[model samples]
Each structure stands twice: as C-alpha cells, then as structure tokens.
Target: FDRGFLRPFGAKMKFLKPDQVQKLSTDDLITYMAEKDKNVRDLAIKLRDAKQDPEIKQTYDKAYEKTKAAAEKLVSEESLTRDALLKLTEEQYVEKAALFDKDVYRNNLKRQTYEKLLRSETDVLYREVARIFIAREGEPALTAKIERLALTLENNADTRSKPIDYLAIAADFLKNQANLHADDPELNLYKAEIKAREIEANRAMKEALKGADKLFKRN
Candidate 1:
C-alpha cells in the first residue's frame, strides 16, 4: 500500500458510479488509490522530462535505467551498511524502508537521479528572474514591493506549504525584517549580527554595481 486515501466527500461523491462507491467502502481501496496516484505522478514526471530534453528521446530508457540503478546502488549501499551495523534484520530493514521510502529515502533517490539528467538544474530559475528584473528595470511593470519580493530568495525554500504569517516568514528570510535600521536582540541576537553583515554586503554590492555599470554603459 502506497497511501491511505481519505474518505471522499461532498461533490466528489456524486461522480462515483454505484460499483465505484462499493469499491471505495473496501479496506484495501487505499492501496488501489495510491498505486493509481503513483502511476499518474510517474507519467507526469516522464512527460516533463521529454519536454525538457527531447534530444534524449531515443536514449531515455537507457539513461533512466542507468540513472535509476546508480541512485539505488548509492542509497542501498549506505542504507544496507548502516543497517548491518545497526543489527537490523531483513524484515526490520524492510520496515524502516516502508517508514520513509517515499517521503525521505525515495524522494532523495529520485532527486539524485533527476539532477543527473536536468542539465539546467543549477541557477536556471535565478537567471530567469534576473532577466525579468532587467527587462522591467524602469517600467511600471516593476513595483517597489514586487522588487523586494522577487529579489528575496534567502530561506525561501525552507518555508513552503505552511500557515506561517508573511512578516514572520520574511523575518526568517531577512533575519531583520522588523528592525531594518538596527539590530534587535528580542527576536534573535545571533541572527541580528549575521543580518548586519548581510546589510554591509548588500551596500557593497550597490557600490560595485555603480562602478560596474559605467563600464557597461555605451555613449
């Protein structure tokens, strides 16, 4: 079983056929639903890969098999060796694998495999955003609020799909969103020190850009 599907409700109940409704009541239905979802996710991943790298169309299977094998070997070697020292039985190892196979171990394996194939995986999004800022440099399309929001990427990846307040999240990223002009020990004293250094680095960047811009400017 891949997952335990929550009981469907409201409008979704209306779309089910009589037989489908009967199947939904069974205890084993979660396994079915999860496998179906896994299949869908795999298809989505494959389609994205083909679109992203059509040049590898002929070798996708060969490439995927080799990458998958390598990732598996890398993970299992570490895992099995650790388990051996941990004195885990085969069944215990299997139980541990089941515990985080998808969310942790499997996701890491897939990430490692995907990184090998995703040639533009490094700073591609950052470069695109830089281009956007350049294109909208002096236009109304770029607002001051948007400029700050778009430019802020620090600790961004750490706060996703959560209910944290915006300013609190900004504080996590900026480390001093509230006290912009000076350090504030009430929140985090160590972070305040780092934040001061960040401010210094930011000011230096502006001065560097000021001098650099003149060299790039054409008469």
Candidate 2:
C-alpha cells in the first residue's frame, strides 16, 4: 500500500534491499525519480535568482538537474539540499553554466571538422541485400550485380584509399526496397519517418506557395 518513494528515496535507495525495490518495477522508476530530479532543478532555479536569462536558466537548469540526479545514485538529500549544500554559493552554478556553454561551443566546432560516417563503409557491407533482392524480384542475377557494386564501393573506401559514396548507393537500394515492401511496415522506422516527413513537407510547401506571394507584396 505504501510502496511509493521511501519518504526520502534519494538517500534511502543505498540502504534498500533488492527485495524492497521489487515493487518499483521499470514503470515506476521514472515516476520515483521525479522527486529527486526536482530537488536539483529547484536548486538551480534558486541559484539562478534571475541573474541568468530565463531561457538559459530554464534550459541548463533542466540539464544540470538531470546530470546531478544521475551523477550520484546514492546521493543523500541532506548531502545535496541541506548538510552538504550550504558550501556551494549561487556563483558556482553560474560558473557551471558558463563552462556548459564553453563545452557546447567547443563540441559544435569539433563537429564541423568531422566527416560524417556512412552506414556502409566496409567491404562486407551490412548485407541488407534483401531489400534489393525483393525489389529485383524479377531477375535474380541483378541482386548479385548490385551486391558486387556495393561490395566494391565499400572495399574502395575502406582498403583501397579511395572515397566512395557507399551510403548513397545503399540509400538508393533501400528506396527500391521500400517501394517493393511498402506494406511491410517493419522495414525500418526511418523509412516510415521519411514518408511522414515528405507528406508534411509537401503540405507546408503548398501552404507557403499559396500565402507567401501576399506577404511578398507587403515587404
């Protein structure tokens, strides 16, 4: 009947027996965690004290709360909000937020320098030739031909010191498979996502075309 939180779960989970937590099935984890996560989120808000931008405090406060909650699973409420909490001034949260922005800027810059990897870059290829096999159902030989092409592209990119659009070839092959298996529904979530996106894309473009000309005249 009283199988909710431990009155102060953030501290009590450490001493709890595995048997005690059995009732807290996977379903209850997120609900149980809500209270502990809130403690840190509220702290960040207090530390912000309106000195930080509302949006900044709002965004980073959520991030800090998440990291802080998971940062120490056995963390005590007294440790975080009472006994061990007073040492940290509001200024430290500001410094943490500043470092957070620095990390974001550094990561964004690093991402720009990285070449995006493709799903197919090895000679073995992912062997999803079944998509092509279904699409090329008419001619069995075409599967071997296209598979060889993918294999060669992968080999060149990986071992032969050459860059090839293996991903492009794989994407084209997958498109044919999607058309062939339109009703399958389990080919991949991305296929379903793409179809839904195109529908939204076309609808938005139509709406823009019908209305943009009027806005254009005002400009």
Candidate 3:
C-alpha cells in the first residue's frame, strides 16, 4: 500500500471511520507537506535563536540537531494523519465563521498570530545574519551589532508592523558593514537616516492600523 494513501485514510478511519478520503489527491498531500515544511523550518529557526544570548547556545544547539527530524515529522505520513488534517480543517472553518460573527475577538487573534509569526521569522533572519557577521568580522564587531540589534528590538517591540524589526536588524548589519569599509561617516549617516525613516513609517502604519491603541487596551 502506498503510505501516502494509507496515512490520511488511516487517520480518517481512526476518527470518522466510515468517512472516505474522497477528493483528496496525492498532490494535495504534497502541497500541504511543502507549505508545512517551509513554515515549520522558518518558525523553528526563529524561536530557536530569538533570545540573542550566548547562554542560549545549548538551546540552539539542541534545536539545530533536531531541526531535520522535526522537518521530517512534519512531512511524514504518520505525522499528517487523517484525523489531524480533518481536525485542522474543522477548526479553520469554525474560526473563519467566528471571525465574521465576532470581528473584534477574531481580529485580535489574527493580529496576535501575525505578530508572533513575523517576530519568529524576523528573529531567525537577524540572528543568522549576526552569526555570519561575527564569523567574518570577529568578536568586537559582533558585540557592536548585538548591542544595536538588541536596542532596535527593545525600542520597537510594541510596534505593530514587524517589518520595523527587520529594519532595525538590517540597520545594525549595515552599520557593521560600514565599519568594515573604514568607518565612512557619510555612508553610516545615510544608512542611519534611511533606517530611522523606515522605522518612522512602520510606526505610522502601526498607529494607522490601531496597533497603538490595541497595545494599550486592556485584554
């Protein structure tokens, strides 16, 4: 038996025993697995290194070791069981209608999830880039970028647009780049202004989106 065919059906059999896995194609499974793999990898990496502390080396080491295993499980036949897919589908449908019925609550949930995912992906990229810069430039440059990235993260944590975080992270990286090129004041100044403006724009967008109000609002 094709494991692909048996897995979801088997899941269905466990949950809705009589329900047939109709209209579900292998392509559907493949697509689902691919999307899942991407999301999981990005998320796992992000959460793995968000803290930006040397003390977290052990945590990251473990996550790095198990990253492939985690990815494998996400795409495995047993991992994407029929019952699990059906449950997820049912939840999505319910949540979709609930959002229409309760816009505020649903929107809150949506915003929270969006922010979490954004932070996760942003942190992953930022940390990996920081690692590369440190590797190339040594400990002194690494210390400077880490401080800058930390400041950026702390300053913009409450902002609604997660891209602001990306800007901050990128700015730190660019500043480090400038240092490598003989501390060119002009180059550094221009990049700094650009980053500041980007951050301001992100703040404005966040405010326009009611993020400021939402942040202060009692949950």
Candidate 4:
C-alpha cells in the first residue's frame, strides 16, 4: 500500500505511474495497489510452481527470473555441454534417448539409422552427455517422460547419480494437464531405456520359442 514498501514492483507495477500515485487519494491508491499486488503474487505462485527440481528449489521462488537463474547453475554440474543442452526442444528429452526421433523408423529403407538419434554408437560418453539435456521444463507431452526418468534413475541405488531434476519439473506441468491413458508417449525419452530392456527380453524369449518349435519339427 505504501509507496516506499512497494518499491520493488518497479516498471511492472503499472499502478506506479506518478499520475495515479499523486492524483489519487491515499486510501484509494492503496486499495488499487493491493489488488495489483495480489495479481502479481498469484502469478508468482504459478511461475514458482513451474519447476520443482531439488537443486533449484533451494534457490527459486515465485519470481520466474529467480527460478530461471537458479536453473542456470546446473549446467556446470551436469555433463551435457552449455550449447548442446540448450539447443534441443523440450520434447527432445521426452524422446527415446533425449536426442532420438523415432519418427524415422515408421518407414524403413533407412532402417540402419532408424534410431540413430535414439540409439548410441559411442561408449558411456554419449549417454552421459545426452543425460545432461533431459529437461524439467517441458510441454504436456514431455512431462511424464521426465518424471518417469527421475523415478527410474534417481531413486535407485544403482543409477542414482544421473540428473533428473528436469523430470520432476515436468510433473507440475502434467498435473495441470490431468489426462489419463495407456501408451501415452509423453514420457518416451525417459521410458525408452526401460522399454528397450523389456523389448529385448521379449525378443530373446520369442527367438527361443521359434528355435524350439523348429527343432521339434525337424525331430
């Protein structure tokens, strides 16, 4: 309500124009300011809710800028390089490898490279580098992916060192979406690893069954 108390509102406080402050009655101005203040506070809450990463929660608040600044610090801690990490779309992390686009697989002659982006040709280096890019700030499609990755990797004693704060961030976004379903591709990138394992296991079983059937026929 007081002019001095509201100083931080700055240029964004449209209610700060001198005409309103000077011409209006003190009581009237304070009431208007209170309304505006509430608006800003509400907006800040939404902005703060945007990301829920543990490393970031320590430094972020309802202010969007502050939360973003806090996020910038993670670049150093994560292996993905500055430029490489920032360039990908939010949907990229939600993909199979965070870089792979399986759309290329639907139609084949290019079969050899179908999952080129989704699969790794290199050693641990590529996966490690790619892991850094997995994001928390994502669209609806990617939220489940991030959260799935977080729950899958970070909690387990085996692969706990990887970064998944971004996955947690996506949870808030998906919570707002609120739709339910099966085969929801939103979390594809995070789930890709797990799914691949499952698929290979099934493939091995199928191959074994086929071999057994063939041997029985021959006998």
Candidate 5:
C-alpha cells in the first residue's frame, strides 16, 4: 500500500521516491515530513511578507518612471514634428529636408524605445498587481471588463498616480459621455501585444501559486 507510487498532485516527488520509501521504516517517514514541514512554512512566510517590503516597491517605482519618461518623449517629439510636416507647403518640405532626415533617424530610435517601454511597463504593473492580490487574499476579484477599462485608462493617463487604481468623475461623463465612450471603449481596446503580456503574467502567477498548493496539500 505504498501511495508514494501514485503521482502526488502531478509534481514528481523530489525527496521521496517509491523505491526509497519502500525501504525506509515508518519512523523514517516522520523524519522526512518534519524537514518538509519547516521548509514550506519558511518559504510561505518569506513570500507573504514581500508585499510589505519598501525596497521592492521603490525598485518597481523606479522602473515605472524610467519607462514612462522614455515613452512620453517618443510621443511628444515624434508626433509634433510629423503633424507639422503634414500641413506644410512643398517649398516648406524642401526647407525642412534636413530636419526630416534627422527626424527619420530619431523616429527609428523612438519607435524602439516606445516598444521597449510598453513591454517593460506592462510587466511591472501586472507584477505589482499580482503581488497585491496575493497579499490581500480575501480581496474580491475584479471582472474582466473592469480590469480592461482600468488598464486602458492607466495606460492613457498623462501621469499615472497609483499602480492599480483609477479615478472617475460624473462631470467627466456629462461633459461628453458620447466622446468618452467613443474614445475609451472598454472591451475591444486591448491590443494583441498587451493581451500576450497579460497571459504570460497570469501564467507566471498560476505556476507560483501551484507550488504553494503542493506545499500545503501534503500536510
């Protein structure tokens, strides 16, 4: 009746193989369990307290600011020059050829920076949100629509205040609920790249939680 022969929650037993367990006596099982018990408790305590650590928050905030600035510069300089070029006369285009070439080179660099900014900041925000959820185990899970809307607003904000929350105003809607809804449509707003990042983030979170699940299941 060696249950060790059975798959233990789909994870291969690292400490106790069936053959090894078959040879060990009942007292040996008690010894092995004691070692595993203390290890699991220590690891759980370390991760649970990670949210309360100030250094982690500061490190992530630094990253958020760096990415934010790079992305902002890309938009401000690149969009302004391109928009002005659109309305200029032919002679004006000839006059600005040098500026256009410079803009072309800078534009290439800006697009690269913008792409990097998008990927890094998405992971940073999602990781922070994941940690908050893990720490506040009893918090209500937000719906998909709400999460998407919050993400859109946060991405579009001129200066994002907090990491995971957003603001709302009745006056904002009344001013132009029509335009607001048009500009900020909830469901279809997410781009392909952003969705992939979120999927990866959730997969990472699930794998970590699964390890915790295994730790407690044996006890």
Candidate 6:
C-alpha cells in the first residue's frame, strides 16, 4: 500500500484463514517488520536528501519512526531473525504494523533527527580541515585548488571522503614539498605528527558529533 492509507491500527483479531496464519512463524513476522522498517528508513533518508518541504519530510520521518519501532517490537516480542520476519503474510503484517503509536514514534524519531544534526556538525570538521591546511597558503589560487581537490575527493569515490583519505593527502603534500627541510629529521617528524593529529582530531570530532549514547544505539 502507498501513503494514502491511514497508518494501520490494531492487531488481527482472528486468523481470517487458518492456513495463512499457520504459514507464518513468530520469527517470520519479526523479520518481515524489520525489512519494512528498513524500507521506511530508506524513504526518509531520500526525502531528507531531496530537501522536501518540512511538512512532507515530517510525514516520512514519522513513518520511518513508526516502522522502526514496530520492527523492534516484533523482534523483541517474537525473538525472530530479521530474515524470518520478512516472510510474514499480508494480514499478519498489518497486525504487527498496527502496534505502533504516534507518541512513541515521535520519541523514536528524535534519534534520526539527532543523527542528521550530527552529520551537519561533521561537515564543520571538513571545513576546518580546509581552513587549517588548504587556507594557510594565503593564496586564493591555492585555496581554490584545494577546494576543487576536496570536492573531487568527496564526490569521486566512497573511500576518498573519509578522514584517512585526507590524512594521506596531507602527508603526501608535506612529503613532496621541495622547500621542506628534508635534512632536519625533527622537522620532518613534526610535519608527519601534525598530519596524524589532524586526522585524529577529525575522527574525534566526528565521533563526538555522533554523541556517546548513540554510538551503540540500534535503530
């Protein structure tokens, strides 16, 4: 079903068809909910990326939370493998789907809201990296070059967007500098240490942005 239907409410009062109910085990139901929950989350993320209107985004956001809570409830109640729950019958699915409440879902929604907020904070770290290394040359052309490189790194490949990628780039830049005092071991070590510390700081800032409690929190 699409978005038009009111969110399903209440469990299946009775098995409409005896064989249909029997076809699904408790484990199957939980797995089914988890799969659906993931779909809702994917939709919410897409909507978020699309920059939909606040009201529209809120709808998907709430739907994501509802499905997530429902998924967890089914798992907790049935001790079902996520895969198993994915196999539940349609009627059986609605029964479990009905378990979610709007109030409870709102609370669950905060988790992702906070997650998106943290992502924004992570972007700040990227900006800081640009400022510290790329901006230090005090030349607009050099700054623009770094900006282009950063964008290419971020968008070219998934692996390149990471902190380690920036660290390597910084290290390579320092190593290749002709003016660098190659004869001075202490200065070389200091340059390498600076690169390492920048990477560590970037990683630590990202970890902090994610918040301590959320690091292990399940969806």
Off by over 4 Å in 1: 1-44, 47-61, 83-219
Q: Write model 3 residue lDDT over 1-219, tens digit each, in one string.
A: 223212333232121111121223433433333232345445444534542446677766565435545434433455244454344432242322222123333343554455455445445545655676678788798787667777867776775544444546655565556567656665456455555555654543443334322322212
Compared with the true structure, the alpha-carbon lDDT of candidate 3 equals: 0.45
Evaluated with lDDT, which candidate comes out highest? 3
Candidate 5 global CA lDDT score: 0.38
Superposed Cα deviation of residue 169, candidate 2 (Å): 0.7
Per-residue lDDT tens digits for candidate 2, residues 1-219, read: 232222443443222222333345432433334333445334434434433445676775575455345423423344334333345433232222122133322332233222232242221232444554556564566657567767766766656353656545555455555677777554454455444544554554344333322222212
Candidate 1 clashes between residue pairs 3 or more apart in a chain or in different chains: none
Model 4, which residues run further than 4 Å from truth?
1-16, 39-219
108-213, model 1: which lDDT tens digit per residue?
Answer: 3343344332323223322343355458574454355445554554436455444434333333433443345244443344344445544554554344333322
Per-model lDDT: 0.38, 0.41, 0.45, 0.36, 0.38, 0.43
Better by lDDT, candidate 5 or 2: 2
Stretches of candidate 3 off by over 4 Å are 1-101, 148-219
Clashing pairs in 2: none
Candidate 3 structure, TM-score to reference: 0.28
RMSD of each: 20.4, 19.4, 16.0, 24.3, 27.4, 14.2
TM-score attained by model 4: 0.17
Candidates in descending TM-score order = 3, 6, 2, 5, 1, 4
Look at candidate 3 and tell me the lDDT of residue 55. 63
Best by TM-score: 3
Give the alpha carbon lDDT tens digit for every residue of 130-197 in model 5: 45445755344533434556666667766635354321221122223234445634311323334554
Model 6: lDDT equals 0.43
